[PDB]
A paper describes a structure:
[name] from [name] K−12 (EcDsbA) was the first and is probably the best-characterised DSB enzyme to date. This 21 kDa periplasmic protein is a dithiol oxidase that catalyses disulphide bond formation between consecutive cysteines of unfolded polypeptides as they are translocated to the periplasm. EcDsbA consists of a canonical TRX domain, a hallmark of proteins involved in redox homeostasis, with an inserted helical domain. The TRX domain harbours the conserved active site CXXC (C30-P31-H32-C33 in EcDsbA) that is featured in many proteins of the TRX superfamily. The acidity of this groove originates from a cluster of negatively charged residues (E24, E37, E38, D44, E85, D86 and E94) that map along a buried channel in the interface between the TRX and helical domains of EcDsbA.
The other three mutants, E37A, [name] and [name]/E37A/K58A, were crystallised in space groups P21, P212121 and P2, respectively, with four molecules per asymmetric unit. The [name] mutant lacked the water-coordinating carboxyl group of the glutamic acid, which abolished the hydrogen bonding with water w3 and caused additional water molecules (w1’, w2’ and w3’) to occupy the space filled by the glutamic acid side chain in the native structure. In this structure, the K58 side chain shifts towards the E24-vacated space, and this change disrupts the proposed salt bridge between K58 and E37. Overall, in the [name] and E37A structures, although water molecules w1, w2 and w3 were still present and coordinated to the remaining charged residues in the channel, the number of interactions stabilising these water molecules was reduced, with the E37A mutant also resulting in the water network being less tightly connected to the bulk water (bw1/bw2). Water w4 was not observed in the crystal structures of any [name] mutants, which is consistent with the relatively low conservation (42%) of this water molecule in the wildtype structures. [name] caused a 2.9-fold reduction in the initial rate, while K58A resulted in a 1.9-fold reduction in the initial rate. Intriguingly, [name] yielded a rate constant of 2.24 ± 0.14 × 106 M−1 s −1, almost identical to the wildtype. However, the double-mutant [name]/K58A yielded a rate constant of 1.47 ± 0.06 × 106 M−1 s −1, 35% slower than that of wildtype EcDsbA. These results indicated that [name] and K58A did influence [name] oxidase activity, but its individual effect may be too small to be detected in this assay. Intriguingly, the effect of individual mutation [name] was undetectable in this in vivo assay. Cell-based assays showed that all [name] mutants except [name] significantly affected ASST sulfotransferase activity in vivo, consistent with our in vitro data.
Residue numbers in the entry: 1 to 188
The structure:
């Protein structure tokens, strides 16, 4: 065939039941994750090719960045809770990796303010039960897929994308191979 285990995807020994259809894990500290999002725009291109009524979910992981990382996982739950993921994704990547201006929890909050989320709305979401559930939820899903690093993407709890078996001499070719694989898996 064109698509094969070992090549564009591997198959989990231990499928995950009731996993989201397409589940991406990342870290604002991860250079490969910054490459996926700021240079390759993996997310956007995958979305463009997902079959009808097939949504993508994105979770932040903790095993990078120490205590700042844990705050970033909670700040991400804030973003998921308020629906502002597309407003803070770029300034958080750049604050962490490019300018290294995010050193503490208040620098994270500043980015949300400058993106239109008012400070009291952020604080309230930050200390809310919904955010606590979403932090726990991100952590559970990482554990359920025995996550060891990021970036990673899983389709229907069964298949793990294998970028390293894709062609990386042309970035645009890589991106369409990645996106097309995710489409192929959604329907497998």
């Amino acid at each position: 065939a064109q698509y094969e285990d070992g090549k564009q995807y591997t198959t989990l020994e231990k499928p995950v039941a009731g996993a989201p259809q397409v589940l991406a894990f990342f870290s604002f500290f991860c250079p490969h994750c910054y490459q996926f999002e700021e240079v390759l725009h993996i997310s956007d291109n995958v979305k463009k090719k997902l079959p009808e009524g097939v949504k993508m979910t994105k979770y932040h992981v903790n095993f990078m960045g120490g205590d700042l990382g844990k705050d970033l996982t909670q700040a991400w739950a804030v973003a998921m809770a308020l629906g502002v993921e597309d407003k803070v994704t770029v300034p958080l990547f750049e604050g962490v990796q490019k300018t290294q201006t995010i050193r503490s929890a208040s620098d994270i909050r500043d980015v949300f303010i400058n993106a239109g989320i008012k400070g009291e709305e952020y604080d309230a979401a930050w200390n809310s039960f919904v955010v606590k559930s979403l932090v726990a939820q991100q952590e559970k899903a990482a554990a359920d897929v025995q996550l060891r690093g990021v970036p990673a993407m899983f389709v229907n709890g069964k298949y793990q994308l294998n970028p390293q078996g894709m062609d990386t001499s042309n970035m645009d070719v890589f991106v369409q191979q990645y996106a097309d694989t995710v489409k192929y898996l959604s329907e497998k």
